[PDB]
Design a protein around this ligand. Sequence first.
Ligand SMILES: CC(=O)O[C@H]1C(=O)[C@@]2(C)[C@H]([C@H](OC(=O)c3ccccc3)[C@]3(O)C[C@H](OC(=O)[C@H](O)[C@@H](NC(=O)c4ccccc4)c4ccccc4)C(C)=C1C3(C)C)[C@]1(OC(C)=O)CO[C@@H]1C[C@@H]2O
Ligand SMILES: Nc1nc2c(ncn2[C@@H]2O[C@H](COP(=O)(O)OP(=O)(O)OP(=O)(O)O)[C@@H](O)[C@H]2O)c(=O)[nH]1
Ligand SMILES: Nc1nc2c(ncn2[C@@H]2O[C@H](COP(=O)(O)OP(=O)(O)O)[C@@H](O)[C@H]2O)c(=O)[nH]1
Ligand SMILES: [Mg+2]
Lengths: 412, 316, 426
Amino acid sequence: RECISIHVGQAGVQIGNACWELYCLEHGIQPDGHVPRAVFVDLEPTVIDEVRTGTYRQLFHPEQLITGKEDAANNYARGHYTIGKEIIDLVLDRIRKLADQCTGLQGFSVFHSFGGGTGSGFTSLLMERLSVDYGKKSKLEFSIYPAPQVSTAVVEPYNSILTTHTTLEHSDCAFMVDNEAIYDICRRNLDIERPTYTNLNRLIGQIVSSITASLRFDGALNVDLTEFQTNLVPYPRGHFPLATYAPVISAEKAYHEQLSVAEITNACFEPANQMVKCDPRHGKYMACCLLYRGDVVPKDVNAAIATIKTKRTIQFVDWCPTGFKVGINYEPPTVVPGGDLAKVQRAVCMLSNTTAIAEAWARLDHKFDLMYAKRAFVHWYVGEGMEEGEFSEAREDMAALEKDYEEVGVDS
Amino acid sequence: NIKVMCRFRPLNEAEILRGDKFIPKFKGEETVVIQGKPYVFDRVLPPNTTQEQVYNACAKQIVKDVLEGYNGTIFAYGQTSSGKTHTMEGKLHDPQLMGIIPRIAHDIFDHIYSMDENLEFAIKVSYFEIYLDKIRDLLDVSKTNLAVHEDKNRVPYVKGCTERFVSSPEEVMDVIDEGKSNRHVAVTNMNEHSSRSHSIFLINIKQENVETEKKLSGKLYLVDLAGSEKVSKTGAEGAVLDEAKNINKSLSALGNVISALAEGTTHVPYRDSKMTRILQDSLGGNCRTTIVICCSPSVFNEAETKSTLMFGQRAK
Amino acid sequence: REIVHIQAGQCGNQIGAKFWEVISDEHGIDPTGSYHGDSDLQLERINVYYNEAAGNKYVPRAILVDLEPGTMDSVRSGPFGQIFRPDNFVFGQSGAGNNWAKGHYTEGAELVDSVLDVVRKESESCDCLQGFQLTHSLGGGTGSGMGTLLISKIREEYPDRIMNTFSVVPSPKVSDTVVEPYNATLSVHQLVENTDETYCIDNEALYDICFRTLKLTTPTYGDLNHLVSATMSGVTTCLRFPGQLNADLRKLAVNMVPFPRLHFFMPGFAPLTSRGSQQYRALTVPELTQQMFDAKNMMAACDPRHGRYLTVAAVFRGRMSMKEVDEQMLNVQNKNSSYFVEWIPNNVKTAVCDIPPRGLKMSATFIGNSTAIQELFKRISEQFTAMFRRKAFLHWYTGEGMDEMEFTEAESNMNDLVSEYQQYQD
Ligand SMILES: CC(=O)O[C@H]1C(=O)[C@@]2(C)[C@H]([C@H](OC(=O)c3ccccc3)[C@]3(O)C[C@H](OC(=O)[C@H](O)[C@@H](NC(=O)c4ccccc4)c4ccccc4)C(C)=C1C3(C)C)[C@]1(OC(C)=O)CO[C@@H]1C[C@@H]2O
Ligand SMILES: Nc1nc2c(ncn2[C@@H]2O[C@H](COP(=O)(O)OP(=O)(O)OP(=O)(O)O)[C@@H](O)[C@H]2O)c(=O)[nH]1
Ligand SMILES: Nc1nc2c(ncn2[C@@H]2O[C@H](COP(=O)(O)OP(=O)(O)O)[C@@H](O)[C@H]2O)c(=O)[nH]1
Ligand SMILES: [Mg+2]
């Protein structure tokens, strides 16, 4: 029934504090109410401390807040092997102590930031140690993969080609939200050149609320977590769909809010609104899980979608007749009291697997090579319990992820 | 130029009853196919290939160059039970069973004696290990932290390394045995060769032409490489983790050096490790280098053998 | 986490006074007083630089190494001078001769053990150690020689913890000493092989940046020092603050050093506007990157425009949009694709603290790893040869128990170091 969550890496923790905020906010549980149902991991104390100093301070148990005073290191190796190792046990312990206390759970919604040290590496083995300790569950990892041109870390790819290959054979469904492609939404669909990280977080903090929160919440067309991976992954590769939200209108500027279904659903497939720089440049969808929430008439959907199924310029895979999982919830969304989110009475958090990422992975793989081609910051990992193996052998890994996402599509 | 040579050993009794199947498929005399992907090298020696045939192709030309006053280097790489000991030393006193080192030493002393007319020979040996990034003399237990220095012509050399005079093939073997007893190895239960450091054996062939007054000094470096360690597996901690990082760093450095030399780069990163700086003079210029990689043909070793194969590919 | 500063030599020392002059105020620590901190955040992470004893006395955890009493006796007899526990003062009343050899082999070598002693008392302080900060000048005895030894020993004692080095490489135009390239070439040598992050500052790159970027007409040393200390605060201490995207010495190290040499950087501060007038506030952000990335404004002597970059780390510290930050960085990376090296898709390492420099609204430390610094070690290396060739003031070295092969060594080494760095400019 439930779904634990492990927010790993400063980012996964910032986003965590955010997604965790939106929660109580739409459940009437102020600062000090019940008890969360997740944990927080980081090898840099000062960040988890922000959850220990700032807002939502006492809504957590100093037990579900793991820290390694030591060093973060923007390098996979160190975070996965060398350092990150020391903490893992302890980490697990909570996701085994928190996993017990419950009643027939469904899985762990993992929150990490692909291209980091504590986020890429660590998790790599966290999800790793999970796939074995609970192979019998769902492992949906919600990632924030590398901005297409606006990356931060100098190494980023090293850290992301490595978190992909190690987690690939362990996740159930990996959701992806592109940090940059979300900015566009903040520039083009909300207008603000002042987007603090605290915003992107409010956003995913939204799209995510549509996943677990409301879905695990009764409705006219419930959709379990398992449901996802089933209706969402055509193949064992921990396939990565993309998150998209519909009413991303500004709560100040424009106001046409009352944008009946027929509109908000069409607003999902236009590439300028998908929290991912993977513009459907060719990527044929192969399965979409249209999660609606608020006042929505099933016919409105079983029509708004029909209209789409016949737009053709939206070309769905061949081997897939119908790939539209319509998830209907009741309670409308719940916007921050005064952030910058419109606040409509219905939304569409559609996520999907698109042959599109054939790109995004490509462009991120290429990156890697360029540097590896010169070993660049390699000495930083080797000296951290890794080898020419793990790199070269994780490169070959993704290689067959560029072929995979190519074969499962583009061909009939 | 640099040459990479792969050697597959036959299957042993300890793995015959294990029911492992031969994953090693061969092509020509230079290619080895593992899981439908080819792996081209300068030469691939199966299991039927003799110690004599292995030596002639990998070491014989380097020995002639050293006796002619030039430098040369021989690297031996492989995981535990790959065949390093058998390939490099074998049955040290048996004529057929003997490896690479007794043969080099045989050929050197066969050139010596045969030239006693105007020539005066001096054979100087040195043996050191790089352990935890420190140069430890294996011939003097008191010299645990030797430093690499440069002469007036920027040539790196190991300062204060023991230089033992050797007048016979047996003297060289005794020196190798003495040094081996000083190497950082772990007490392991069943197996001869498992190390936690890289080993460098130096054979310096000095000659003075009494009448011509002209002198030659050729350096032969015999490098014993500890295998790359995946520290996630093994679960190495403390000093063992410091050992594993140091072995891995050194192999990366070495790979970076051979790759640069193979591509004919103007910059060769000898400064990446103390090992590559000790070998700088013998790796650069008019010097032939052979990397001998030993692997197993077992289906269980497919991971560690593909690891040994990719290291050889790095050299090229 | 933690670190333990090291004030090697006079310069490195003089600067200590300025680095601590600042940092303290950036942490509300009065002379011997405690935390008057205008806020409450300038305390949760102090540990990085202090120690708890009394309850109002958080003492800087640095080391003051010098063979010239008068110096430390000027730093200890002035302003904040009375905050260091006397135990910190590792003096060498000997003759602090201006010889690298006199402070590395003969005179300093003695005072070393009585230093390492303390560098251990401070390291074994508490919690977990990160690394050590090292200030000094590569143009003297107690600086290049003795300080360059202090590290060679440190890096044998904890090859785990990091080593940032703040070196005052010998300014071009005019040398404030004569053997300079001797004391220098010899110390850079030691650097390229122990510390793993070096921030090279030039007394004349500062003047310039301090007399034209600060209409400041009488730039006393105190100033230069002050400006420098401003950067080293943005680096360390800063990142030991919260941030949307924070990093720490390692991130900085693990994102900036592609190849083990250690490589040296060139720090640059953000808001560098003259007092009254200039107080333009054009600091939205494009103004900071405008700043940081220009030629002038690079504490180094060389000009970036003269050689690609390998890595860059804009360590900003003041509330801003992870969008207008992450974005700007890009255009910057495209307007100058020319010089920014290619085999690194994203050279830049954007870092973002929250709280800014006490009295300012928005700043951003710049730590550049450009190939341009090739044209400096060249300089140094040249000066050497031109004088080595004639063994100029060599008797002051050898006569102190040195070697004719020692100088050879260093030059070459550091000389090769120039070579390599070009391997990427191409
Ligand atoms: C009224 C007002 O706003 O005054 C400003 C001011 O006028 C200006 C000109 C300051 C001023 O700085 C200088 O004039 C200066 C003098 C010598 C060397 C270098 C700089 C200032 O003195 C410096 C001072 O800086 C700080 O307070 C920072 O926290 C800074 N602190 C110190 O350097 C410091 C100085 C004395 C004692 C202890 C610390 C800092 C910067 C980075 C990391 C840590 C701390 C500031 C904003 C100002 C004055 C006071 C006039 C500027 O410098 C800095 C470092 O902020 C010079 O250009 C900037 C722009 C500022 O607006
Ligand atoms: N949406 C969103 N992205 C974030 C947030 N914080 C960081 N990121 C992104 O995630 C990545 C940053 O990871 P870091 O904060 O460096 O590291 P970490 O994953 O927390 O773990 P360490 O490297 O060990 O500190 C970058 O790509 C950021 O753009 C956040 O609050 N929201
Ligand atoms: N920025 C700066 N440079 C200094 C200071 N003091 C000396 N220097 C520089 O240091 C060099 C001289 O070395 P010095 O510090 O006297 O050596 P030592 O005292 O014998 O170790 C000259 O290049 C000076 O410009 C200072 O307080 N600040
Ligand atoms: Mg973090």
